[PDB]
Design an enzyme around this catalytic site. Sequence first.
Site, mmCIF file in Angstrom:
data_model
loop_
_atom_site.group_PDB
_atom_site.id
_atom_site.type_symbol
_atom_site.label_atom_id
_atom_site.label_comp_id
_atom_site.label_asym_id
_atom_site.label_seq_id
_atom_site.Cartn_x
_atom_site.Cartn_y
_atom_site.Cartn_z
ATOM 1 N N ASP A 1 29.136 16.545 -19.042
ATOM 2 C CA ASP A 1 29.194 15.729 -20.116
ATOM 3 C C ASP A 1 28.990 14.024 -19.618
ATOM 4 O O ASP A 1 28.452 13.332 -20.366
ATOM 5 C CB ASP A 1 30.175 15.772 -21.184
ATOM 6 C CG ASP A 1 29.777 17.138 -21.996
ATOM 7 O OD1 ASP A 1 28.561 17.675 -21.956
ATOM 8 O OD2 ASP A 1 30.875 17.605 -22.570
ATOM 9 N N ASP B 1 18.606 0.535 3.663
ATOM 10 C CA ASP B 1 18.028 1.225 2.358
ATOM 11 C C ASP B 1 17.293 0.005 1.665
ATOM 12 O O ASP B 1 16.377 0.523 0.858
ATOM 13 C CB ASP B 1 19.120 1.423 1.373
ATOM 14 C CG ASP B 1 19.630 2.895 2.048
ATOM 15 O OD1 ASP B 1 20.218 3.703 0.932
ATOM 16 O OD2 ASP B 1 19.637 3.172 3.015
ATOM 17 N N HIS C 1 25.435 18.512 -29.162
ATOM 18 C CA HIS C 1 24.469 18.406 -27.827
ATOM 19 C C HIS C 1 23.114 19.280 -27.703
ATOM 20 O O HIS C 1 23.355 20.563 -28.103
ATOM 21 C CB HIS C 1 25.349 18.839 -26.802
ATOM 22 C CG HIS C 1 26.569 17.781 -26.459
ATOM 23 N ND1 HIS C 1 27.611 18.132 -25.654
ATOM 24 C CD2 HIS C 1 26.779 16.796 -27.052
ATOM 25 C CE1 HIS C 1 28.338 17.224 -25.922
ATOM 26 N NE2 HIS C 1 28.035 16.106 -26.762
ATOM 27 N N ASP D 1 22.325 20.810 -25.271
ATOM 28 C CA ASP D 1 22.250 22.076 -24.219
ATOM 29 C C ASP D 1 23.127 23.207 -25.072
ATOM 30 O O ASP D 1 23.372 24.262 -24.450
ATOM 31 C CB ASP D 1 23.110 21.630 -23.063
ATOM 32 C CG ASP D 1 24.686 21.016 -23.042
ATOM 33 O OD1 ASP D 1 25.013 21.198 -24.299
ATOM 34 O OD2 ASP D 1 25.113 20.750 -22.180
ATOM 35 N N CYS E 1 35.062 24.374 -19.371
ATOM 36 C CA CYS E 1 34.584 24.320 -18.149
ATOM 37 C C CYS E 1 33.178 23.386 -18.104
ATOM 38 O O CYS E 1 32.478 23.391 -19.035
ATOM 39 C CB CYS E 1 34.372 25.358 -17.475
ATOM 40 S SG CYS E 1 35.702 26.590 -17.181
ATOM 41 N N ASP F 1 0.798 -1.240 0.072
ATOM 42 C CA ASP F 1 -0.071 0.075 -0.013
ATOM 43 C C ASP F 1 0.926 1.126 0.072
ATOM 44 O O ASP F 1 0.494 2.402 -0.116
ATOM 45 C CB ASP F 1 -1.013 -0.060 1.059
ATOM 46 C CG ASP F 1 -0.446 0.000 2.637
ATOM 47 O OD1 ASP F 1 0.708 0.419 2.642
ATOM 48 O OD2 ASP F 1 -1.052 -0.450 3.429
#
Lengths: 639, 639
Positions: free
Chosen positions: B334, B163, B442, B444, B618, B123
């Site tokens: 990356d 855990d 990429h 990004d 960077c 549950d």
Amino acid sequence: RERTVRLQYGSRVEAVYVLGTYLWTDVYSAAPAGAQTFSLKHSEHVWVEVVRDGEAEEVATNGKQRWLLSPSTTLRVTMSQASTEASSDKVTVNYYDEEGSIPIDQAGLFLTAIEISLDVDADRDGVVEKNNPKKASWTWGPEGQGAILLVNCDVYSKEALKDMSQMILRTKGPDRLPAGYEIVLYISMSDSDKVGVFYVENPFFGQRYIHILGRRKLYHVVKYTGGSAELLFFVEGLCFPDEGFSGLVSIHVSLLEYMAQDIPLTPIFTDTVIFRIAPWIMTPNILPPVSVFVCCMKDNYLFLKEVKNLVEKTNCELKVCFQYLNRGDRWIQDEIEFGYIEAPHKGFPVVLDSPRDGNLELLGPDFGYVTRVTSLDSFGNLEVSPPVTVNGKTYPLGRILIGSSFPLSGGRRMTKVVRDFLKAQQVQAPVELYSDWLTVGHVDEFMSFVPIPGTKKFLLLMASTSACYKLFREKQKDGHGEAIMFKGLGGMSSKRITINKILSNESLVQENLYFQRCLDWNRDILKKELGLTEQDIIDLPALFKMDEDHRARAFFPNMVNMIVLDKDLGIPKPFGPQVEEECCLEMHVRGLLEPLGLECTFIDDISAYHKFLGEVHCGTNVRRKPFTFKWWHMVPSRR
Amino acid sequence: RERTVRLQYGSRVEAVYVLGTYLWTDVYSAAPAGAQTFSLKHSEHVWVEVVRDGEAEEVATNGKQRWLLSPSTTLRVTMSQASTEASSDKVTVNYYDEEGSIPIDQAGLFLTAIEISLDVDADRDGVVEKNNPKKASWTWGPEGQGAILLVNCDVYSKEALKDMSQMILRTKGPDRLPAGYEIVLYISMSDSDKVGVFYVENPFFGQRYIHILGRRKLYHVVKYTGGSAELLFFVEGLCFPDEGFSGLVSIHVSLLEYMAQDIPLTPIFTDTVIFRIAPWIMTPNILPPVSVFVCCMKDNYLFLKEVKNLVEKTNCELKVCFQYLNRGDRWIQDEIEFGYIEAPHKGFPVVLDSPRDGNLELLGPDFGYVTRVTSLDSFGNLEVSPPVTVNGKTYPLGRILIGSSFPLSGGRRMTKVVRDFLKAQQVQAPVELYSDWLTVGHVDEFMSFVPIPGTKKFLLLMASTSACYKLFREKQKDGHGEAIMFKGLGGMSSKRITINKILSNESLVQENLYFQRCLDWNRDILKKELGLTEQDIIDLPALFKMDEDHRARAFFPNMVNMIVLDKDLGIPKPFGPQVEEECCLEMHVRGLLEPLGLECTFIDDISAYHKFLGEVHCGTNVRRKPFTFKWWHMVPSRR
Ligand SMILES: [Ca+2]
Ligand SMILES: [Ca+2]
Ligand SMILES: [Ca+2]
Ligand SMILES: [Ca+2]
């Protein structure tokens, strides 16, 4: 779908517009530096809105209206009808500086509108409807939609493609696409071994249908014709769902734009249809029989005569097959399984074939054929229940049953490939039983199903050793202990097997108590997984001998494996002890079944061999009509 | 569940009864031949019904009632409480012939009742409830149930098992199982590489937790203790869902009955629990930042100083990492991706690691770690959107975005293994974009997301070449054409790049028009698949140069790839043309973002290199708090 098209200044942008989309158009980037305001004109069949900040206003074909130039002020451009040769579809934007009211520059957008739709029968009526809004998805159930593909179970001719699914590319537009566009149909590499697609590439030169998509062919450029046109494609499935294949495939069409040499073409518009490949479905004994197939040696005369007389009582046809070098004596039962596939447009019976020694036959053009170890791999070890509801969950096609061993036993199991195939069909939700207590290891040795005449209901029939011992003990008490089994089988005579000899055999009693435990374990699983109660079950007398592996073989022929043709039952003749010149096993079985309106005919398959050692030398299988319930109307549990 | 138990006569049957089942009992087979009627007695805690034809009547402990012996007249036997040492639980049946009222024989059933339940937290509250009726299934959504397992991302100690998921075998019964029974926990061979199970085998000798189920161990016999007992097990997942693994595993317990030597044990009762292994989930820029990780060379002083000043404005912590021999200069961006997993009982952040050259680091015990080609395989090519609703369909965890090439292009694509991994997590429903027009490839490089301060809303930020050309053309018109880029970068000085030099470069204009088409293709997919309108998008000025493959690299640093900490944005410093001693690119970007309450800080990562050739040296990555929405409350589309 909104699509980005920007103006470029001093100049013109030309673009294809695909109906069903609209354009958002940046007019600011094309403005000369230092320009302040803009105005626009447009043609009759292009609708233009000026959208400021997200507030849109419709603009007339020729007004004088001006708006401030802003990055947040854009155009929305819509067209509701395809272009023709009479079309000049355009939008023109004029730019102004602060100084005066005469345009300092202008940027145009010239449009050619076309309709492009890849269409299939997603609503599952057999007709290919125009652009079904749900065609790119596949959903189960009564309200579900999306197209269905049949596996092909058999330059090309159209007549041969009649069984396949239709897919139609419908277009509308002017005489030709503008310079630098083409239309391409394609599939993924993954789907390339799941499907094939055919069409006529050159209709001016003949009707030849060629394979354009499939193994090694992932894309096909199609010729555009103007006006309203349709290209007809035929699609086939190459394989059934399996462990790694859900049954779903996709086909795409794209309008591609040529950019320049050594640059990929840009996908301007893409349309997609999805197909599900129809699963293989097994037919339970409650479905109407069509044809009865039997195999035996040519000289088993009694078997053939009696099977013929049985079938003559029905409206079924009989098909007689003999024995083959590459196959077992039971092959029509063990190596062949009759099933079907169905799509909205059509369906056919499909036989699975697993020859003992491999292939070197077949009966009829009417069937599709699918051709492929322990004895558990046999189709005698596969059965399917009538439709059942279990704790509120319905299985409208029934459930497949497969014999196995206990999970921790280290015993035999049907091969993974077959188990996974059956599981992947999904619509029969298979259940494993316990067959590994039998030497041969087939569920058909201990159980079967029969319809109850005049009703929609059915019975589970179970072999029972306990019923046999009770009957024999009764007959012995009655003074019949010296009654002999196997009368008329000359090779058995010297054994002088009587009810007394059977009942006094202590080890055989113990063996059969153990076999009854095995039967009862199965009984419990069947009641649980099929939603059955004791009222749904009849126990037929049975008896087994044990081998060195502690496994069972029939002592006398197993009556449970019978030919079921509606009310009429072909039941293996048991050769039981005679009382008042009738077999007490036949009389007992009649007393169980006949009051329910079942008609019993006993069929002698063993006399031709003069003895019975536990092996049966004949086989039968019945081809049945498919379920009326459409498989695509089921809602299987998600995996 | 009804279970079959038959009597045997002159004699006794002994059986274990598991609470939650009941027995149906044949009394007819044990009747002596020629017996007519039967009667019965039973003990206080056994409930007995006589069931004739399906009509059931409760029978007293000692009555004198008699019934006709019939195969269709049976007993139903129920027990509601486990046996103790004080129990004598039994049913006895007497048989009678016609002649008289004194029993001619008797058959007993001696019972030992036990409770056996394998329990989990189905549950989803973190507690292991008693025998959840749904524990054998797994369903998605707010009302869904079934237990959840975490992948272990790191003789054993209990602290190390904290855990894991708890599974408790709860039993109740007398001092010992009757002769010939044992209880066995087990899993399938298939699941054996997906899970492991631990417990203390010998609690008298210490607390040592041993691995009892997993690779090479498919079953474990557990010791039965009497009275009310619990055995505590800990369960770990070994791997995430993937192409061939749904995430579902099962664990079973069976009560087995010993038959005899060389015969498999019979599974009298089986109980099953199912677990789903929790998926890896990515965190979008709208989630609260916790820690900022950066990597650079030790002497890039300005970058470090300015990142520190940025982070000091926030409540986040900064973690500074240097460069490693086995990794690229951007590795924290990356080669590392921050994500999390969650179960009802606990959750933690989990980093995916894909080192350029392979492993030889890590930051902190707080994270789980999962360690694994073209440049598209980089995590710079992976992003995730904020939660969106698209045509009525909600994605409460957002959607993962992966850069790719066009389907027919023959271009680069992220490896199948990673694509399939992301797809199998299911809860972020990935979308492919087009990144292959960029040299590095990429997503990004061209897009990002930012929250709108003071609201629950967000913006998509897109690189725009069109915005850059508009701005430069404006500044030129204003008399600033001689304004120089790259001021202060000594290695760029001899190039003397000015707004005039850029605007007069004809081939560069054409290249960037083409790149704007690539950006716009992405814009359209993002609007479609994220449900975005033009009001949700801001365009940041960008400029690219083309390589021999016709692919783009940044002309000046790409501002879109920025550090997002709520209202505060670390934005790569562009080194644009100076007007009135301010970079016109910085001023333009401030004018776009600042009115929305976003605070811009420009961060110089390139000065330490004296020039910019399109490469950034960077990287940054932000660990964020997980979504408040529980992933198990989602209802993903069925595959
Ligand atoms: Ca239709
Ligand atoms: Ca079969
Ligand atoms: Ca709980
Ligand atoms: Ca990333």
